Design a protein around this nucleic acid. Sequence first.
DNA 1: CCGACGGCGCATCAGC
DNA 2: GCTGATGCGC
DNA 3: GTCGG
Length: 314
Amino acid sequence: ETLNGGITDMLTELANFEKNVSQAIHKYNAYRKAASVIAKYPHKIKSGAEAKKLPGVGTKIAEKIDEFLATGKLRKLEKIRQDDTSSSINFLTRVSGIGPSAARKFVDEGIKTLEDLRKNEDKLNHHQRIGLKYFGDFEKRIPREEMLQMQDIVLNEVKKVDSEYIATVCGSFRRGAESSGDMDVLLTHPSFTSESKLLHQVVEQLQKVHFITDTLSKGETKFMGVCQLPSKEYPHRRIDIRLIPKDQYYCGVLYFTGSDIFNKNMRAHALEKGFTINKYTIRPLAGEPLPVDSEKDIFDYIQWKYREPKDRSE
DNA sequence: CCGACGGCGCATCAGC
DNA sequence: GCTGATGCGC
DNA sequence: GTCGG
Ligand code: NA
Ligand code: NA
């Protein structure tokens, strides 16, 4: 972090302002991509020209790096931080359910703080009210030990509903991360295929044992909500539950396990072998989806040795 | 030069 | 009432 | 904002 952390922080902050204030999602991801490539660069950057050599770093970011290296700051960033309107809009987006559009509209009518939000509940939708309620909790990390306890409850209640369900907790947790941002559960059932109330019954049971406390959104295939471990008080946590057809399950498991870089790498290697891999299916290049009965079958199609989630960092 | 860049489920808005 | 668009999160 | 057709 001592290497280029000042630079990566700069780029991340620039990314947020492009997304939240300028509403320029592609510049946001552009800055994120540059922040990422620099964070992995194993040398202390001495000039913008040096950084320019990295994929994702272009002329403008090189110039910004040069300014930061010679001054220790960015004039535009300094001004942006001081701007009451831009900083308020940017801050409100930290509330789950409040995006750039809602944030801008709130600030336009003088609603700029959590306090302003708290006294204007009528102007918030259901999601936003929940995001406001658990503002602090949602920004907390989840230690692996708690994630394990959360997994214990999910797997137990799911099997209690129907022992033929298959549930897999994915995300960085499955790769063995020491902490998580949330819990992502992938769910399937032999009766659910692409050719032919499964989710509801699982959510219902998890609510019954007081694990799930709130609901952000819920349909026939995707639940997004809030959960909390029983106290022997634990912070409330974000949990998503996805119902996926059996024939698409393991492609989904692979995708949502990650990492993002590993997925990009696995898709690239797949393309050179004559296959295309998305989150749903794998198809020869696109023809019809190939039968997939496990994660390993995906690796075998692309002539890869089966990679354990632990080693899917890159 | 200039278009692509994560794609889609759900909630809610815009409009008929 | 509906269909389609938009916002949002991931 | 950067990349590449
Ligand atoms: Na570059
Ligand atoms: Na938000």
